[PDB]
Amino acid sequence: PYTVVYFPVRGRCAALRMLLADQGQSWKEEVVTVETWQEGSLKASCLYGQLPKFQDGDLTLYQSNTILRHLGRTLGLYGKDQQEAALVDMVNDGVEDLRCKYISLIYTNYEAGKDDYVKALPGQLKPFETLLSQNQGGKTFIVGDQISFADYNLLDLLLIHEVLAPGCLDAFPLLSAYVGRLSARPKLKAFLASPEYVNLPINGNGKQ
Amino acid sequence: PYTVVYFPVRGRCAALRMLLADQGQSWKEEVVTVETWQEGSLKASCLYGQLPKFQDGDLTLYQSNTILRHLGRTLGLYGKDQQEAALVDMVNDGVEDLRCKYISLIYTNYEAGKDDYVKALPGQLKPFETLLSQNQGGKTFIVGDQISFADYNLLDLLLIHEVLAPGCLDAFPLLSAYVGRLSARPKLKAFLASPEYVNLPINGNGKQ
Ligand SMILES: CCCCCCCCCSC[C@H](NC(=O)CC[C@H](N)C(=O)O)C(=O)NCC(=O)O
Ligand SMILES: CCCCCCCCCSC[C@H](NC(=O)CC[C@H](N)C(=O)O)C(=O)NCC(=O)O
């Protein structure tokens, strides 16, 4: 079945976890402690020397977005056709771009870079609001009328940014309602309120 | 048909161009000058305010990796099954990770960071050599026995690094032979020797 190997943080595993939970899938969490990691053996066995590591039967995967696309492909959360599949990728690549900046700020220069980052945030979120405005008035999902892996990834992106910059979605009504709507999905809402998610820090350095 | 909108550089369009050329596809190049860009009109119309922009019929796309996956999906260069498709993604995500570091060095701190970057390069390339060593002794492609979009992206990554750090592939027999082998493909070899590729700078700031 499914196994996710990661440090005890939400980080790059939050979106895929939301996906599995919302889709009613079962998986095992293999928690790797900083000590175990510093031992070196696991890290040396990882393709790119990093986590998360994911297992689907004997298929071993690395790279958070590969896991998301794999689950999206296998579970039918990758658009209804090739055109939608491309739009889903366009959304996810954009989500990834901002996540990288978020990650850089959090771990590289939180104190000195936060003000500049928050000032530039609106412009960074505008694209997703626009995407929403062009798809059924933003009443359904980011692409098409069915959920996709990019939805879970974008939702996480938005959630963590509201912790970083409380109220950042006030400027974006479609994104605001989208967060509330997706968060209300029964299995997702239950997962998001579970200690399995809540008692885990967003990042690994105590910043958010 | 196909249209790629970009600045007059190889950058993030090199891989997809190699793909189209090698696959015998025709496309139009719409060159955007720094002046035209600074005007602001085109940039404001771009989803994430950046290039490349890609057009396939009435389908408009942004994000270099979205264009690669779209071409891979529609042209049959995305693995033979879901398992291979995931491995292709894993390779491309890894290629993207290193490309981002390469781009950061080139445009952010070439002079001061080059030495450290080159020292860390072997460890950054090892994963791709390992990937090749696990797929038919590295005698075919990065994943499976058929070419994929990740091949064109990895090939470009390797080509530009050979310019940045001559001989970086010497210690990697599989990657070395792979570059020579893929570069020898008739249509690709012809494209790589054409002025449309050769007379274009790798990057936009005169560094490489
Ligand atoms: C409470 C303790 C928390 C543990 C320490 C903080 C964990 C931070 C998240 S893990 C950070 C890093 N992994 C990555 O950056 C993964 C990026 C990869 N491109 C992906 O998308 O999957 C990694 O493996 N880093 C380890 C390494 O590179 O050695
Ligand atoms: C000799 C002159 C060449 C032009 C000058 C150098 C151009 C550098 C390459 S273009 C750089 C930037 N685009 C990107 O970074 C694209 C990132 C996107 N995630 C992708 O993968 O496609 C961009 O649009 N930047 C423009 C902007 O953000 O306004």
Domain boundaries, chain A: 1-77+186-207, 78-185
- Tokens 């080059």 correspond to B114
Residue position matching structure tokens 């020579």: B180
Cβ-defined contact of A86 to B59 (cutoff 8 Å): yes
Identify the three-state secondary structure at position B71: helix
Method: X-ray
What residues does A56 pair with on adjacent strands?
A2, A59
Could you tell me the CA-to-CA distances from B179 to B22, B155, B159, B161 in Å, in that order?
14, 6, 8, 12
Q: Specify the CATH number for A78-185; select among 1.20.1050.10, 1.10.10.10, 3.90.1150.10, 1.10.287.180.
A: 1.20.1050.10
Reply yes or no: is the peptide bond before residue A166 cis, omega within 30 of 0.
no
Cβ–Cβ below 8 Å for B61 and A100: no
Cβ–Cβ below 8 Å for B63 and A131: no
Is A54 in contact with A5 (CB distance < 8 Å)?
A: yes
Q: Nearest residue of B to residue A130 by CA position?
A: B47
Which string of b and e fits A148-167 if b means at least 16 CB within 10 Å? bbbbbbbbbbbbbbeebbee
The residue type found at A47 is L
Ligand 2 centre from B64 Cα, in Å?
A: 10
Give, using CA atoms, the residue closest to atom 15 of ligand 1. A50
The pick from A4, A5, A6, A7 for probing ligand 1's pocket by mutation, whose C-beta has the most ligand atoms within 8 angstroms, reads A7
| CATH topology assigned to domain B1-77+186-207 | Glutaredoxin (3.40.30)
Contact B15, B153 (CB under 8 A): yes
Which run of H or of E encompasses B60?
A: strand B59-62
Find tokens 């890290």 and name the residue. A43
B8 lines ligand 2 (CB under 6 A): yes
Question: 């979106």: which residue's tokens?
Answer: A15
Q: Can you tell me the distance from the alpha carbon of A15 to that of A22, in angstroms, rounded to the nearest whole number? A: 10
Q: From residue A30, how far is each of A10, A12, A20, A40 by CA, in Å?
A: 13, 15, 15, 17
- Residue type at position B161: H
